[PDB]
Scaffold this active site. Structure first.
Site, PDB file in Angstrom:
ATOM      1  N   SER A   1       0.855  -1.179   0.000  1.00 35.48           N
ATOM      2  CA  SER A   1       0.000   0.000   0.000  1.00 35.48           C
ATOM      3  C   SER A   1       0.892   1.230   0.000  1.00 35.48           C
ATOM      4  O   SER A   1       1.702   1.409   0.915  1.00 35.48           O
ATOM      5  CB  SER A   1      -0.936   0.010   1.211  1.00 35.48           C
ATOM      6  OG  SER A   1      -1.636   1.237   1.302  1.00 35.48           O
ATOM      7  N   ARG A   2       0.747   2.072  -1.020  1.00 35.27           N
ATOM      8  CA  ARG A   2       1.568   3.267  -1.140  1.00 35.27           C
ATOM      9  C   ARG A   2       1.050   4.424  -0.298  1.00 35.27           C
ATOM     10  O   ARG A   2       1.705   5.469  -0.239  1.00 35.27           O
ATOM     11  CB  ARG A   2       1.657   3.691  -2.606  1.00 35.27           C
ATOM     12  CG  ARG A   2       2.198   2.604  -3.516  1.00 35.27           C
ATOM     13  CD  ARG A   2       1.894   2.896  -4.972  1.00 35.27           C
ATOM     14  NE  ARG A   2       2.726   3.971  -5.498  1.00 35.27           N
ATOM     15  CZ  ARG A   2       3.790   3.782  -6.266  1.00 35.27           C
ATOM     16  NH1 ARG A   2       4.180   2.569  -6.620  1.00 35.27           N
ATOM     17  NH2 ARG A   2       4.480   4.838  -6.690  1.00 35.27           N
ATOM     18  N   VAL A   3      -0.103   4.263   0.347  1.00 32.94           N
ATOM     19  CA  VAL A   3      -0.661   5.258   1.250  1.00 32.94           C
ATOM     20  C   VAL A   3      -0.604   4.776   2.696  1.00 32.94           C
ATOM     21  O   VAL A   3      -1.174   5.412   3.589  1.00 32.94           O
ATOM     22  CB  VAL A   3      -2.097   5.627   0.830  1.00 32.94           C
ATOM     23  CG1 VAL A   3      -2.590   6.892   1.529  1.00 32.94           C
ATOM     24  CG2 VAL A   3      -2.181   5.781  -0.677  1.00 32.94           C
TER      25      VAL A   3
ATOM     26  N   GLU B   1       0.238  11.689  -6.034  1.00 36.40           N
ATOM     27  CA  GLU B   1       1.661  11.721  -5.711  1.00 36.40           C
ATOM     28  C   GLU B   1       2.285  13.053  -6.108  1.00 36.40           C
ATOM     29  O   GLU B   1       3.100  13.612  -5.363  1.00 36.40           O
ATOM     30  CB  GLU B   1       2.384  10.563  -6.397  1.00 36.40           C
ATOM     31  CG  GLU B   1       2.080   9.202  -5.799  1.00 36.40           C
ATOM     32  CD  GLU B   1       3.058   8.137  -6.251  1.00 36.40           C
ATOM     33  OE1 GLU B   1       4.088   8.494  -6.859  1.00 36.40           O
ATOM     34  OE2 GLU B   1       2.800   6.943  -5.995  1.00 36.40           O
TER      35      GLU B   1
END
Ligand SMILES: Nc1ncnc2c1ncn2[C@@H]1O[C@H](COP(=O)(O)OP(=O)(O)O)[C@@H](O)[C@H]1O
Ligand SMILES: [Mg+2]
Lengths: 56, 250, 470, 471
Positions: free
Chosen positions: B113-115, C194
């Protein structure tokens, strides 16, 4: 004790030789499938390229 | 309008196939795997429309959970790679894990998970920070420990802890549990309080712990749900010890 | 007179017919500004870029935005020049789109500001620099094990969790502080959230005052995704040429630049290439990259984050991209978890500048010894695993003892993140890095605890930190 | 009345030009009836189905028979309706072709019987039923690891020469004899010998009095193989709707439908798909599969055989069918060679009815334990091949010991296989299967040799076989 150590070393040697033979057989059986998949991939790629060219 | 929306796409692979069929029927030139070019643009345009609006825009949010179905567990295919390159992570499911007794068969190694971190409460973050390291160590050791016979003390402790964690992480279908109780159970697991419990008894231990918390220690649950943070450590530890004493080990 | 008509609309590609003797040149910009005649039509403000001359006075163009609402027969005006973006001091601290229009809430750029064409031939052979030079970054890991060639291309590898944004901000800060040059960021086809997070991080850290950003994230059409990088390149070229200073150019993802061209090639009407890419992939990539060069005055050095789909390094786009790189930096999640920031992998990172005739014999020897010791430590970790629980010779203990100190000394405090940790940060010259690593190898500080080597900067900072610890 | 003219003939595809303003609708039936004008011509009695409107008053059609003898300029008649198939109580006990003409030599259908169009839209969303109930089959592995569903869709995947036909025959022999409803068999793209044998089998058994058959076998041109499935399905739909009966539908190699579609697609002028299939593979299969559903008026339970080309389970035709089925059995050549019959994969096979609240807690637990131990045995295969049994841990030896016996006990002897081996066959109830597998898992029969579990049936037959061998 000395006899047991000698037997242990001989048994380990034999087991390792058998393992190497089995690994080599597995390697060749896998290379056959690798060749088949390589041929299939080349055929699919060339077919797609030719179809795309003909589409124009 | 300032509300929060959740969107689930049952299968984007079906959409991709339908779009490919339509493009081929319209006599557009096909590309890789007969998929038309801009097949990536289609999914990027679809998925990029989900966002968390700023305060000036009303504060609304839309979250999406696209689905992609793979063939024979191949994650490096065209559509799976295209979709993976767009989203903020992926949850990978595996058949070998599914049939090995692990449901819902989450593959922790290949999932990301990039968050992560920002999407968790303080208690959950401070409790589950080390769980990824725990699972990584467990998998790395178990990859060969069944024949290595290394039997080092640290390796044995890590293997036991990882097995207990894997047993803990299992769940039943249509059985959701509150975040506070999740925080408490992973706290008990990580603190090592269940290190002496048998693996087969771990699940019954968890069920009995939930039942015990339903009666006593409810103020801990109220504090967690009201302040989004862990209660006092000593009170939680003594409640865990009391439940462990009243628990019948089989 | 000099107006055109739309005759075909097929997704991002639009065909325009002009009168005889008034065709627009290749790469020119065409504007469609149509007002709603009734309730069955919608307003349009769209920009097209000329791609091909199809004959019969017709021209095939690619749109910079959505083509929904276009009607066969609309009027098209010719700007007479390729897309032009503003350049100068006005671009610093602002955020632009592919057309050079600000997208932040501040005021618009005045119409009298200087604007430059996007498309430009690369500088010729006689103008380039005749020798290799090293860009001093002030980061110990980079300056030791992978020097950045001034004017060269550097590939950056790494996912989420590692400090990619932190490294970018620190590089911009150090370069602007020491070399006096600005940086430029080009968000080619990546995640919008991002990009927004990076913008807010830069604004909070204060580095935003000396940078310009162009965003072409993956919600934009391939027409914009192709040209965002070129707009950023022109913005940096202005400062390279006029101000004559060394600058930085960051590209969010160079693979999307080729992917957009691959997407538009089929609609333009070219035969497919090997893996469905465009036949002009190599020449397009070369025409983009070859403008990033060091000249007699100033230079442009580029940090390009590269994404390899499914880790297939034989893919044509990464294969073409890798032919231009000069260095490589890999970010390691294992190092990030261990706390060794910047989490730059000391073994995976490589650079062609690490040569005795470029960095010096002493520098080369120190770097090679460090790499050998770290390789030996990596081997000995595996040897400790798989039986052999801490049963090794004396030299193994010695090399492990040295390797832990080296690995912890590779860490460094930054000027950024001082708002999160009260340590002001430091800028460590390459001579000091070499001297400190040489002293560590020689055993001058082998008796100190390894915890004293973390986030120090210079070699002495270790001794003062250890003295403070007691 | 309006008439057309033949323009182009290219294999099974014929172009017909009509008068302006009188083009036939898509899916209509056209008739060509020509008498030999001279000695250099042949008589023709052929039918066509409209596929595309090419413009300028031209229509592209698909022929249902051989196009040999067609001449550019022949006259074509438009019937004004799709292919109409006789349906009702007349169809029971008869054998038809794709066009609905009886081929059993048992008389001719009356010319005033009810006939239904072969093409119709699928049932609506609100007309469906979602009740789940187990259909007992008497096969140990099917009843244990992948129960069937009454009124659901069942698929039997498999490669060439693996046992799909044998499993179909066994299922017919176990279910159709006592079902008490109405059965329909559609043998699309299969052996005429198999069709004749199966017809004689129902004639001998007396089941033929309550079944209808449409064959359209593999020797036919692709036009007939593309539509015989719908020809059977319209009879099944009539029996479901008008009379509210319970209908069994058997289809052999539904993959031949998509194969014929792909064969025809090239001549129609469409861009090829990924591996040469038609672009419309998904929608064409959906329009057929979605009509086989159980509604409020009646229920249709369908068992379909699916062919896997070159044993490639990722081929688009087998891969797309997986989303339409409820219970699937995956046959494997690797298991077939070892001697396990049926050679069904115990792990790849899945069913939507395998839930604790449907089959029972004990059944679910036993099935999960069996799958877990089989998965562990499969994982240990590489280590077994490389090093051997000597390097396994103490409990892994037990896992292998139990797993081999479980795998062998999953086999069974079939009633239909008696004529080839002499084994009388068996019918094992699900309770007996669960009890036997639970006993095996508990370690009650760890001493018996693994060959005693091979082809017995009930758990007591294992003990009898071992005692006969001399244990
Ligand atoms: N239960 C069984 N016992 C013994 N042999 C079987 C059994 N099931 C299938 N077979 C073997 O399978 C073969 C028939 O396969 P078949 O079903 O015709 O293949 P396909 O699935 O391609 O139609 C026979 O030769 C037979 O020996
Ligand atoms: Mg068959």
């Amino acid at each position: 004790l000395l006899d047991a150590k000698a037997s242990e070393h001989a048994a380990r040697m034999t087991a390792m030789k058998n393992a190497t033979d089995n690994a080599n057989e597995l390697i060749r059986t896998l290379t056959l499938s690798y060749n088949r998949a390589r041929q299939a991939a080349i055929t699919q790629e060339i077919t797609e390229i030719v179809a795309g060219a003909n589409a124009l | 309008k300032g509300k929060h929306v959740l969107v689930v796409y049952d299968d984007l692979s079906k959409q991709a196939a339908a779009y490919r069929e339509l493009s081929l029927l319209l006599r557009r030139p096909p590309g890789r795997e007969a998929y038309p070019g801009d097949i990536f643009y289609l999914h990027s345009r679809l998925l990029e429309r989900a966002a968390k609006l700023s305060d000036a825009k009303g504060g609304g949010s839309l979250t999406a959970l696209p689905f992609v179905e793979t063939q024979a567990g191949d994650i490096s295919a065209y559509i799976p790679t295209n979709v993976i390159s767009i989203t903020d992570g992926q949850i990978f499911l595996q058949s070998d894990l599914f049939f090995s007794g692990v449901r819902p068969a989450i593959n922790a190694g290949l999932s990301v998970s990039r968050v992560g971190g920002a999407a968790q409460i303080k208690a959950m973050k401070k409790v589950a920070g080390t769980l990824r390291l725990d699972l990584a160590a467990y998998r790395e050791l178990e990859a060969f420990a069944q024949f290595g016979s290394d039997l080092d003390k640290a390796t044995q402790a890590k293997l036991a802890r990882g097995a207990r964690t894997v047993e803990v992480l299992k769940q039943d279908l249509h059985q959701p549990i509150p975040v506070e109780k999740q925080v408490l159970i992973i706290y008990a697991l990580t603190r090592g309080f269940l290190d002496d419990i048998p693996v087969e008894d771990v699940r019954r231990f968890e069920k009995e712990f939930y039942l015990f918390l339903d009666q006593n220690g409810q103020h801990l649950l109220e504090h967690i749900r009201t302040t989004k943070d862990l209660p006092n450590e000593d009170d939680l530890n003594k409640a865990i010890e009391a439940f462990k004493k009243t628990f019948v080990v089989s | 007179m000099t107006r055109g008509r739309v005759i075909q609309v097929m997704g991002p590609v639009v065909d325009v017919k002009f009168e005889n003797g008034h065709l627009p040149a290749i790469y020119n910009a065409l504007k469609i500004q149509h007002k709603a005649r009734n309730e069955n039509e919608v307003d349009i403000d769209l920009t097209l870029e000329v791609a091909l001359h199809l004959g019969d006075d017709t021209v095939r163009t690619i749109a910079m935005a959505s083509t929904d609402g276009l009607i066969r027969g609309m009027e098209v005006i010719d700007t007479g020049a390729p897309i032009s973006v503003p350049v100068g001091e006005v671009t610093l601290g602002r955020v632009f789109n592919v057309l050079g229009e600000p997208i932040d809430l501040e005021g618009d750029i005045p119409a009298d500001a200087r604007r430059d064409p996007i498309h430009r031939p690369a500088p010729k052979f006689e103008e380039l620099a005749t020798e290799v030079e090293i860009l001093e970054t002030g980061i110990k890991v980079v300056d030791l094990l992978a020097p950045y060639i001034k004017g060269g291309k550097i590939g950056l590898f790494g996912g989420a969790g590692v400090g990619k944004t932190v490294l970018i901000q620190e590089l911009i800060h150090n370069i602007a502080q020491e070399h006096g040059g600005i940086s430029v960021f080009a968000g080619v086809g990546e995640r919008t959230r991002e990009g927004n997070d990076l913008y807010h991080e830069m604004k909070d850290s204060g580095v935003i005052s000396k940078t310009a950003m162009v965003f072409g994230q993956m919600n934009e059409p391939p027409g914009a995704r192709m040209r965002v990088a070129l707009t950023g390149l022109t913005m940096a070229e202005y400062f390279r040429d006029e101000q004559g200073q060394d600058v930085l150019l960051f590209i969010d993802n160079i693979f999307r630049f080729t992917q957009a061209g691959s997407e538009v090639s089929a609609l333009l009407g070219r035969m497919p290439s090997a893996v469905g890419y465009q036949p002009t992939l190599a020449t397009e990539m070369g025409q983009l990259q070859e403008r990033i060069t060091s000249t007699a005055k100033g230079s442009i050095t580029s940090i390009q984050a590269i994404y390899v789909p499914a880790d297939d390094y034989t893919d044509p786009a990464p294969a073409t991209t890798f032919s231009h790189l000069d260095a490589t930096t890999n970010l390691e999640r294992k190092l990030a978890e261990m706390g060794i920031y910047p989490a730059v992998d000391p073994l995976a990172s490589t650079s062609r500048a690490l040569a005795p005739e470029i960095v010096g014999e002493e520098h080369y020897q120190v770097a090679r010894k460090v790499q050998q010791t770290l390789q030996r430590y990596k081997e000995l970790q595996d040897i400790i695993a798989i039986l052999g629980m801490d049963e090794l010779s004396d030299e193994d203990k010695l090399v492990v003892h040295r390797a832990r100190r080296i690995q912890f000394f590779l860490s460094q405090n930054f000027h950024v993140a001082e708002q999160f940790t009260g340590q002001p940060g430091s800028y460590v010259p390459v001579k000091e890095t070499v001297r400190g690593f040489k002293e560590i190898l020689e055993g001058k500080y082998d008796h100190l605890p390894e915890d004293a080597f973390r986030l120090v900067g210079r070699i002495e900072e270790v001794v003062e930190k250890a003295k403070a610890m007691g």
